[PDB]
């Protein structure tokens, strides 16, 4: 439970000279880059299980060896990448545990011979797009709608992004990959083997090792596409019209479009912006959104034109292009809680009229809802162990979020929460009730380690969070994992089991 002379002087012998141990204090070192990377504040608390020591690898053999040093000793091995888990699975666990920060290993290589980029897994989204901005302008990626997201965990689960809709996810544009295992062994694709590498590509972050490095292919893009980001004020009559639309508009579009919705409330006043992305340019958009979606009532000055970077930046909600490589440019200050649903049905406008009900009794929170389809559609179920593919229409995810001056009611966040996915149920996906790995949700359940009646029951009382998140694909993840890990090391609530 200590850090101690064993392992410190294990790290200080392998060169690994970047870490810190456990200290209360604020002006502390530890205690700075403990929070650096915390993205949901309801995990910062003094309350807390707190790590005993934070390693910062600079290299990938420091990686290694910190992996090597912290299995001589009795530690839970904890990654953090972009810190962005849902649940604080990174920086958070209940056995004592050492704290692996990758924020040093944030480094691009752009190939643009090739079309591809290694990128070193503690990089986030914003600083390997920045990167590809600043090699190209005729190239970029898709991961997620969030700059400060590491690709670590994001493409670890996948990564869901503004033009998935024509690549699929992140994950599913991973050629390679550098794996470190649970002895520090090095493995590239050649050396895991294909299991594994199916594995690391969806199949969720904390499970299989430390990802050292992504290698990606990179995605053509225009040197021109369109957006826009239009939030429209309006009643709870009109805003459900434009909801019910929305979701066969979104869904039906061609692969060059995607929009999406963000969505919230307070009593009469609901407030609905919509963010849309054209591949291609504003005339085709605007024609396009005027055809399929005039009741939207967006006009010529609504339709920018912008390199993908930029696009990326505008409807992230940056100042600038810039700031996607500022990894601490805090997204939200705010605590939330953030439950997630996959459609494969239409859902019925009384859905989206009691969500948007449930949202004017609760300013707090919010929803967004993404469509799939197009490259989503064609992309098999057992690619990558993500399986929403064909059939899948939308993402449903409702937010609830609060400042410190409201944590006290924070509770009553919850239940609203709890309330709204409780009303969701009969609308969305059934037996099971499909999730998503990067949205992970400690409602459905989780394992206790330490509880050896859980552990030798653990595939099956993992499968309920396990066939929400993969479905078929969950036994094709047991098998990787018993290959590539058959002692646990790589564990965490959620975490797939080894076999028995
Ligand atoms: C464990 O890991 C942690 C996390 O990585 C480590 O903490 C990090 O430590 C970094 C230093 O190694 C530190 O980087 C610094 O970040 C600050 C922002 O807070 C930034 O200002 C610093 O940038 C200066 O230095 C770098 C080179 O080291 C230069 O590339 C850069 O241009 C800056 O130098 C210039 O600006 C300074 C003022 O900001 C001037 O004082 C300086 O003279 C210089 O000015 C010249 O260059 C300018 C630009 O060309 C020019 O305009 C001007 O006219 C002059 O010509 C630096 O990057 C990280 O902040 C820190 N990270 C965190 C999160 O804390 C930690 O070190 C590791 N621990 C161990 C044990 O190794
Ligand atoms: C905070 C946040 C998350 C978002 C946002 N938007 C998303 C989007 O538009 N599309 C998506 O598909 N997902 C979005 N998400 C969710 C993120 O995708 C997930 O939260 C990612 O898992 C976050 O990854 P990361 O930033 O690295 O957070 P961590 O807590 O460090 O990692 C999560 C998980 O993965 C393990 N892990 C981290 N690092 C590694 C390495 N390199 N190797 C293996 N495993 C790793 C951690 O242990 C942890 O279990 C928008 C916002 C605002
Ligand atoms: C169009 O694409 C999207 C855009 C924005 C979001 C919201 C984002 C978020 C935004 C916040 O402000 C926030 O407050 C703490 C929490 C969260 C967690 C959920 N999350 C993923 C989701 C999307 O899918
Ligand atoms: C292990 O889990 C089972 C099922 O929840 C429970 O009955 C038992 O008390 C737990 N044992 C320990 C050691 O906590
Ligand atoms: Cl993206």
Same mark, same amino acid.
């Given at each position: 439970?200590?850090?101690?002379?064993? %392992?410190?002087?294990?790290?200080?012998?392998?060169?690994?000279?970047?870490?810190?141990?456990?200290?209360?204090?604020?002006?502390?070192?530890?205690?700075?880059?403990?929070?650096?990377?915390?993205?949901?504040?309801?995990?910062?608390?003094?309350?807390?299980?707190?790590?005993? /020591?934070?390693?910062?690898?600079?290299?990938?053999?420091?990686?290694?060896?910190?992996?090597?040093? #912290?299995?001589?000793?009795?530690?839970?091995?904890?990654?953090?990448?972009?810190?962005?888990?849902?649940?604080?699975?990174?920086?958070?666990?209940?056995?004592?545990?050492?704290?692996?920060?990758?924020?040093?290993?944030?480094?691009?290589?752009?190939?643009?011979?090739?079309?591809?980029?290694?990128?070193?897994? !503690?990089?986030?989204?914003?600083? $390997? &797009?920045?990167?590809?901005?600043?090699?190209?302008?005729?190239?970029?990626?898709? /991961?997620?709608?969030?700059?400060?997201?590491?690709? !670590?965990?994001?493409?670890? =689960?996948?990564?869901?992004?503004?033009?998935?809709?024509? &690549?699929?996810?992140?994950?599913?544009?991973?050629?390679?990959?550098?794996?470190?295992?649970?002895?520090?062994?090095?493995?590239?694709?050649?050396?895991?083997?294909?299991?594994?590498?199916?594995?690391?590509?969806? +199949?969720?972050?904390?499970?299989?090792?430390?990802?050292?490095?992504?290698?990606?292919?990179?995605?053509?893009?225009?040197?021109?596409?369109?957006?826009?980001?239009?939030?429209?004020?309006?009643?709870?009559?009109?805003?459900?019209? $434009?909801?019910?639309?929305?979701?066969?508009?979104?869904?039906?579009?061609?692969?060059?479009?995607?929009?999406?919705?963000?969505?919230?409330?307070?009593?009469?006043?609901? *407030?609905?912006?919509?963010?849309?992305?054209?591949?291609?340019?504003?005339?085709?958009?605007?024609?396009?959104?005027? %055809?399929?979606?005039?009741?939207? +009532? %967006?006009?010529?000055?609504? &339709?920018?034109?912008?390199?993908?970077?930029?696009?990326?930046?505008? $409807?992230?909600?940056?100042?600038?292009?810039?700031?996607?490589?500022?990894?601490? %440019?805090?997204?939200?200050?705010?605590?939330?809680?953030?439950?997630?649903?996959?459609?494969?049905?239409?859902?019925?406008?009384?859905?989206?009229?009691?969500?948007?009900?449930?949202?004017?009794?609760?300013?707090?929170?919010?929803?967004?809802?993404?469509?799939?389809?197009?490259?989503?559609?064609?992309?098999?179920?057992?690619?990558?162990?993500?399986?929403?593919?064909? !059939?899948?229409?939308?993402?449903?995810?409702? #937010?609830?979020? *609060?400042?410190?001056?409201?944590?006290?009611?924070?509770?009553?966040?919850?239940? *609203?929460?709890?309330?709204?996915?409780?009303?969701?149920?009969?609308?969305?996906?059934?037996?099971?009730?499909?999730?998503?790995?990067?949205?992970?949700?400690?409602?459905? =359940?989780?394992?206790?380690? !330490?509880?050896?009646?859980?552990?030798?029951?653990?595939?099956?009382?993992?499968?309920?969070? +396990?066939?929400?998140?993969?479905?078929?694909?969950?036994?094709?993840?047991?098998?990787?994992?018993?290959?590539?890990?058959?002692?646990?090391?790589?564990?965490?609530?959620?975490?797939?089991?080894?076999?028995?």
């Amino acid at each position: 439970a200590e850090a101690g002379n064993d %392992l410190l002087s294990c790290l200080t012998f392998n060169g690994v000279r970047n870490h810190t141990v456990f200290s209360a204090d604020s002006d502390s070192d530890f205690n700075r880059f403990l929070h650096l990377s915390i993205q949901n504040p309801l995990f910062q608390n003094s309350l807390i299980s707190k790590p005993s /020591a934070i390693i910062l690898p600079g290299s990938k053999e420091e990686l290694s060896n910190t992996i090597r040093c #912290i299995r001589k000793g009795s530690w839970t091995i904890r990654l953090r990448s972009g810190g962005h888990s849902y649940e604080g699975l990174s920086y958070t666990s209940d056995t004592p545990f050492i704290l692996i920060d990758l924020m040093n290993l944030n480094r691009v290589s752009i190939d643009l011979e090739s079309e591809t980029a290694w990128v070193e897994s !503690g990089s986030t989204l914003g600083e $390997l &797009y920045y990167a590809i901005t600043e090699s190209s302008s005729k190239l970029g990626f898709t /991961a997620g709608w969030c700059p400060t997201v590491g690709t !670590g965990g994001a493409i670890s =689960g996948g990564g869901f992004g503004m033009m998935s809709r024509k &690549y699929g996810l992140a994950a599913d544009n991973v050629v390679d990959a550098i794996l470190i295992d649970a002895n520090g062994a090095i493995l590239d694709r050649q050396a895991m083997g294909e299991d594994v590498f199916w594995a690391i590509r969806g +199949g969720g972050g904390g499970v299989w090792g430390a990802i050292y490095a992504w290698k990606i292919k990179l995605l053509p893009v225009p040197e021109k596409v369109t957006v826009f980001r239009v939030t429209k004020n309006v009643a709870i009559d009109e805003a459900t019209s $434009l909801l019910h639309k929305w979701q066969f508009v979104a869904e039906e579009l061609e692969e060059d479009f995607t929009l999406s919705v963000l969505g919230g409330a307070d009593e009469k006043q609901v *407030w609905l912006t919509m963010l849309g992305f054209h591949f291609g340019l504003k005339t085709v958009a605007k024609s396009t959104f005027d %055809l399929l979606f005039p009741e939207l +009532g %967006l006009v010529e000055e609504d &339709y920018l034109e912008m390199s993908w970077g930029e696009s990326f930046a505008y $409807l992230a909600g940056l100042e600038t292009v810039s700031q996607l490589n500022n990894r601490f %440019l805090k997204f939200d200050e705010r605590a939330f809680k953030t439950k997630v649903d996959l459609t494969k049905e239409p859902l019925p406008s009384k859905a989206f009229y009691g969500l948007l009900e449930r949202l004017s009794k609760e300013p707090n929170g919010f929803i967004a809802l993404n469509g799939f389809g197009g490259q989503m559609s064609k992309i098999s179920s057992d690619f990558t162990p993500f399986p929403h593919r064909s !059939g899948t229409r939308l993402m449903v995810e409702y #937010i609830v979020a *609060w400042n410190q001056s409201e944590q006290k009611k924070k509770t009553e966040f919850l239940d *609203w929460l709890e309330k709204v996915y409780e009303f969701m149920k009969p609308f969305v996906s059934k037996n099971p009730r499909l999730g998503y790995v990067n949205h992970i949700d400690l409602d459905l =359940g989780g394992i206790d380690w !330490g509880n050896k009646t859980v552990v030798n029951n653990a595939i099956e009382i993992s499968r309920s969070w +396990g066939e929400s998140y993969f479905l078929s694909n969950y036994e094709r993840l047991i098998r990787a994992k018993t290959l590539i890990d058959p002692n646990n090391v790589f564990n965490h609530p959620q975490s797939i089991p080894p076999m028995a």
